Write a protein that binds this ligand. Structure first.
Ligand SMILES: Nc1ncnc2c1ncn2[C@@H]1O[C@H](COP(=O)(O)OP(=O)(O)O)[C@@H](O)[C@H]1O
Ligand SMILES: Nc1ncnc2c1ncn2[C@@H]1O[C@H](COP(=O)(O)OP(=O)(O)O)[C@@H](O)[C@H]1O
Ligand SMILES: [Mg+2]
Ligand SMILES: [Mg+2]
Lengths: 232, 232
């Protein structure tokens, strides 16, 4: 589903051409849990931004579900992200004055404006909140009234919202504790294995990378090696 | 307040190095209404992104209130945008499930978390809504219940919110009609002239550019010329 061919991403700081991704080659299978491991600076997040269609590779070529995103105009690019990708992050990113169920409704508003009813949005939003294994009785609560763990479960239901086959997570458990951090992981595993979601998680903590079928070790902008752990 | 020195912004599309801003030099005085005029492609918005601290110049140097933003880490960069800049755009950008007054509270939440009270946020939010000349009786309304004009008045109160000396507008009246489009302009004029705000507006419609003390004509990434219209 996600595919890369000779991607490079440079950052011109003037006289300093810095390379974040160098001649990187990858191919993520549909419904495959993959993890990008590396220290701060490896180029992990840069890659999560390109695959997420948040950025353009200074070379190479990105394929999302076999579709070359490179030349797509911003409008078309936004159609990709909103339909083909589900985002999650370390920084929860919830709106402070919206109920857990409202934060899940937003993406659905932006995709289906004027098509779906308030009743249908409230329903889908809950299905995704229930799917993200957050008790229904916590739907009406706002951000600061939920455990940091419950908060990530909201970012997850919001990402699952418009039903994207892809889910990218950037150091999702960085903000949590080992115990709840594992539940979230066990949750991405659930989605991938059962629901069939193509999960790609970026991390520096190897313990998280182990939930992936394969870890892709990234070093100073380049892929040092790959590690297959399961599907033999 | 805003200052540029030999800024260039290139976009590597691979074998194609495209230039959006080429060796551009500018200096906006404090409390000065300036307009960047140009056809779609001039490089206007690119410049609005750099001045807004949304992007980094591939060369040159940006000064916001005399402070060089170039080397600032993302955290420090965010402190700049949230404290020194007030954004507005053609695309209103309001959250659909939040009341006009709530959309104005958000920036204040993000800057003053845990410091200010619900009562103080509700007050400042209204002051800015009243300043943006939107009747107080429209505070409790949500987006789709306000005239497109009332909606821009919300983006304006939200921008004025954390009290930024700067206000950048990107084709603010593009989405409106001539009549209400002029009221919004007359409103930025109000802020600049009375309140003392440094207003910089990016546009392709010359009729809007005329509210500026000087128009900066931009052509294919370069400043073709400048036009002083008032302070002689
Ligand atoms: N917007 C940017 N401007 C300049 N350099 C960048 C930018 N984004 C990333 N980099 C560079 O890319 C490298 C790492 O990329 P990054 O996305 O931060 O990955 P990681 O999460 O592993 O640190 C760093 O050396 C950094 O300097
Ligand atoms: N993210 C980008 N990637 C590649 N090219 C860009 C990007 N942003 C702007 N450009 C280029 O910059 C030029 C105009 O810049 P832009 O910000 O769109 O200004 P304007 O509003 O006047 O069109 C165009 O030629 C465009 O191709
Ligand atoms: Mg990172
Ligand atoms: Mg533009």
């Amino acid at each position: 589903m996600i595919k890369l061919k000779n991607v490079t991403k440079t950052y011109k700081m003037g006289e300093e051409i810095i390379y974040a991704l160098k001649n990187v080659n990858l191919n993520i299978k549909e419904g495959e849990f993959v993890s990008i491991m590396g220290p701060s600076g490896s180029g992990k997040s840069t890659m999560l931004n390109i695959i997420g269609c948040l950025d353009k590779p200074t070379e190479g070529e990105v394929y999302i579900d076999n579709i070359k995103t490179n030349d797509l105009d911003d409008d078309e690019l936004t159609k990709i992200r909103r339909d083909k990708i589900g985002f999650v992050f370390q920084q929860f990113n919830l709106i402070p004055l919206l109920t857990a169920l409202e934060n899940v409704e937003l993406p659905l508003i932006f995709k289906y404006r004027g098509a779906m009813s308030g009743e249908e949005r409230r329903k889908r939003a809950l299905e995704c909140l229930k799917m993200a294994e957050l008790e229904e009785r916590f739907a009406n609560h706002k951000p600061n009234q939920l455990s940091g763990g419950q908060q990530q479960r909201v970012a997850i239901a919001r990402a699952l919202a418009n039903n994207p086959p892809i889910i990218l997570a950037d150091e999702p458990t960085g903000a949590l504790d080992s115990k709840t951090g594992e539940k979230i992981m066990q949750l991405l595993k659930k989605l991938n294995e059962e629901d069939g979601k193509t999960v790609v998680v970026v991390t520096h903590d190897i313990n998280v990378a182990r939930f992936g079928e394969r870890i892709i070790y990234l070093k100073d902008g380049e892929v040092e090696r790959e590690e297959k752990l399961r599907g033999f």
